[PDB]
């Protein structure tokens, strides 16, 4: 089925300061499904940075890439139809286009292959000026 996620939140911003991308879908979207960022520079590979699904009641799973754990957070409303990451401490490595992803087969927030993902949004540019 077509799903179009899409980002925002993606801007010029400068080392050592915060940025928080959101994405939700236009239209059909997903219930209880491990949603992801990813993200990759011109040339690169796609890199996982962060993964999120719905827990019992209110809670969610959460699991972090090594280059940003303490400083990146993913967080999720489902009201809203809206997942999120806040992004701390921003560094010049963390420029690239950052990615909304859904991985349908997962059934727990893990490592995400960018391989396996079976949906993926438009991208935001994230820049960060050393």
Do not use: C, H
Request: proline share 2%; hydrophobic share 40%; charged share 20%.
């Amino acid at each position: 089925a077509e799903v179009q996620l899409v980002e925002s939140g993606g801007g010029l911003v400068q080392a050592g300061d915060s940025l928080r991308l959101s994405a939700t879908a236009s239209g059909r979207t997903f219930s209880r499904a491990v949603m992801g960022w990813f993200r990759q520079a011109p040339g690169k590979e796609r890199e996982f940075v962060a993964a999120i699904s719905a827990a019992p009641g209110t809670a969610y799973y959460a699991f972090y890439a090594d280059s940003v754990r303490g400083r990146f957070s993913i967080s999720a409303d489902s009201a809203k139809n809206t997942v999120y990451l806040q992004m701390n401490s921003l560094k010049p490595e963390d420029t690239a286009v950052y990615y909304v992803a859904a991985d349908l087969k997962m059934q727990v927030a893990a490592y995400m292959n960018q391989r396996s993902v079976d949906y993926w949004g438009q991208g935001t540019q994230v820049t960060v000026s050393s």
